[PDB]
Amino acid sequence: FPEDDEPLNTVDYHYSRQYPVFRGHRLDFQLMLKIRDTLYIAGRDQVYTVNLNDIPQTEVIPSKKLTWRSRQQDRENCAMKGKHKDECHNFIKVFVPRNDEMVFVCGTNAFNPMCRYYRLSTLEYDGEEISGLARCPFDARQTNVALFADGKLYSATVADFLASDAVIYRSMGDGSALRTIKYDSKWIKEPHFLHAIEYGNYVYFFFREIAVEHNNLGKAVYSRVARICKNDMGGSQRVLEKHWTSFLKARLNCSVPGDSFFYFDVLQSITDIIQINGIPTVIGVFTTQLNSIPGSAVCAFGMDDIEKVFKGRFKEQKTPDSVWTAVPEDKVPKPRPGCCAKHGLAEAYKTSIDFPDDTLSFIKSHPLMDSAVPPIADEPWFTKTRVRYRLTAIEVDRSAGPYQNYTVIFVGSEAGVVLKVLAKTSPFSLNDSVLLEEIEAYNPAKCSDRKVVSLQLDRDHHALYVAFSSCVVRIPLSRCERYGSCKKSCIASRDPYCGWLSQGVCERVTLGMLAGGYEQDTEYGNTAHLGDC
């Protein structure tokens, strides 16, 4: 079992108090999204715009802003239902561009979810309100997912005021209004939706939920990745009518090997598809259970490894007192459940309504796969145990350093501790993943509660925006400033962003000179023939 690595460098508040924050009267940060050279930040009643080329002086000021508050009658209705007015606000929870000019923005609107269209360049409300049912949650403490694929919006949230109908929904475009089965613990059980990606012929979802492979034990939570077809048209007139015909979910296996594997089963966040040395990869942050000893880790799963688990066996529970087992291959119907029509094995079907009742009623009671998704190298890329907090947010620089052939990973924490890790992704690389720097990003004087929410890499401007429930802080990716001319300090920090120069000092690799001009040893860090400055 690994041990907590020692941070090669630390950055306390006093070393980070010299950094600008955003407040804008609570911010109530909900999400953020970067397009080209502009970062939108969605909180309570407002959506701010920040020019990433505008380098701040006193404080990052919003270039523009979007105002949309709940009409007073909405607030009075939210009060009549019996919820406190602090929740009776229009917390912007959905902000997804449909094309290169308009954006779909959904807010909770005092527990009456609504949706509108705005223009990106001018933040102009051009149009009117689409209802927000099954697209924006009623509560701001919930998570939610919203994605656009070929014109159709795939959402994931709750659809009722009582917060009981957790659902994956799809609408808009030129298809049909599909959804999961209401109150069907076999399909999804008290989940917390996190992320979603569009790959191949499918759209994958990433969430966590109460596990049914542990129903004889406790209410343990597993990490699931679900999958649906883009061209899903629905079930036949008697089976799966107005429901999904390819909803397949599998388990993600973030574990430490040995004689008794240790599993990080709770998922806190994940990235999009990142090209990590030739192959597409998704990198997730997994902590342990609630009532457990807080430990966290960072696993990475490939997209071929995730497509294979769905090409595998299904999982069933024959008797109520038997262990969940794999369904034999000669007992699964035809065509191959989960395959999309007009593709591969189901190419003899042009619509999902022509699907037989043999296959559609099978996937209705066997939606869980048998295999679990293994990570690469079969061991996490980083872990953190001996501390009192859990890691949350995540972002990755796939190309770091002068030759941009190194991967860096930035993770959040429940206590505003953003960790920067040089990660090992290939056999021929390091010996272990090196925690380069540990930063205290929370700004008690500037902010206000110190749980990192999300991280946004600004690679071109060499920055990382760290989110909290009341502030966003711009932290430089590097800190070669503090090592200065102490050539040791810089080489012994092993930072790929920092490079030493003949001019007698060590600075960022994004300065202007050739890659060969910078000198460093991020691999080993050979301190030979040097002095303690």
Added chain:
Amino acid sequence: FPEDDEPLNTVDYHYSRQYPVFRGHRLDFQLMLKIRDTLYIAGRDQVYTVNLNDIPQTEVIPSKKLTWRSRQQDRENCAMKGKHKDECHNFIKVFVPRNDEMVFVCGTNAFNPMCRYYRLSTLEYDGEEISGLARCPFDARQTNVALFADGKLYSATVADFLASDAVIYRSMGDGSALRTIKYDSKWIKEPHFLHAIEYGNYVYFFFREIAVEHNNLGKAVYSRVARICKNDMGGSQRVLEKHWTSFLKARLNCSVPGDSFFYFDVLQSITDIIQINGIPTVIGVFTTQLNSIPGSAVCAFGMDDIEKVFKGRFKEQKTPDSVWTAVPEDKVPKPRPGCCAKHGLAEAYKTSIDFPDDTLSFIKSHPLMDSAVPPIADEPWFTKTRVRYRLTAIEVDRSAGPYQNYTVIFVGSEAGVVLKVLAKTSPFSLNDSVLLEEIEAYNPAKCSAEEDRKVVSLQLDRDHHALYVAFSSCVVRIPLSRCERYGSCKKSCIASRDPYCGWLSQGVCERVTLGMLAGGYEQDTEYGNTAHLGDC
């Protein structure tokens, strides 16, 4: 899920180095036993006697000594046995008094375990040798158990030089030589025996072993409390010839509740029967798995609940790929398996051989109970999670304080640290457990002269207000209270909340064991009220 408490006070080295250490080429400590005011320390080749009435001046000086080095041919045969010369020594692994005059002593003898009888008064070889097979281990690095109950000795160890046949065994009596079924993975699978206790009509064993219920999952480790009957003599000629007809084992449940129970199932050490709040309980140290996040806890189980667990239903695996579930109460054969003959539900059967064969062949294929022994007061009595090390040894003072109504637990560690914890036992007591002091015990100057500082065992010298922390090469006498650390500062006194210390009108607070009336010592062990007390 709670969190680690903060030490009210910490005793560092440069304070603890003002304490005497015992040293007796190393020592290779193995065990220690307290008889009245005498302590027997058993290590390699030798057995030391120290008088708990002799206040040390510079070093713990042993009074009497017993020597027992191995045979000349047992050094060089053990040389032929591949074993290193350091391993080829007579490590005393068993030292148990049979009566109040002589003692059974078993040693490894360079992987040729043998037993003898000595006299406590003289430590003289006043007997003749006995073979230590199934009684004393071949290897010193392993654990073992030995106990005398009703004339006979009940051992539990390994029996072969290759360390494969683990066995619970009985001898030194009028019957034959009973033992567990060798290689029966459903009876015993790779265990580490830790303790045994005679209670009622049974001898209960306490150990840990690879779980049979995690056959599908990983090689987990479950903590087992087993039990055998004392009047057992074996089965009939047909089934279980020269074997136990009452071997019943249950699982120990050290659990933090909630929507996802957190379990400590690796047993490290345990105590004997201690009367807590009126009922006999047993207190034990559990830790998480090896390949897990290091955490540890202190749980307490009442004997009544253990018996209620053993009077319950058995556990079976109906299908290879199914969950272990209970056996119906109509399918349990008569007489009640596990019950001792001449008692309760076997009052008619006068001997375990009069038993049938369906009952035996049932108890032969169902040695594992279904229920798990619940811990007292749901959540564990103590927890330690954020540290890099695991707890080990355990000792308990059940009558701390000037009124002797407080339970103070001392727990070892893998890094020479000892934790003193006033435990919350009954509801109408504390709010939660209070770890008063954290004592660094390992003495780098004396305890070594290689750096391994694993606490092995502890012994409570309540009659002399001490605690002999044991290591692999030293024993450190450690008082139960440094009431001198506070003295003048009433704030520091009531702030440590130690029941061993109390405040006096003389302006200095002291050990409550000084000879004055109980109503004279002022303290507040229920809250820690530093109100209206100046910061001295």
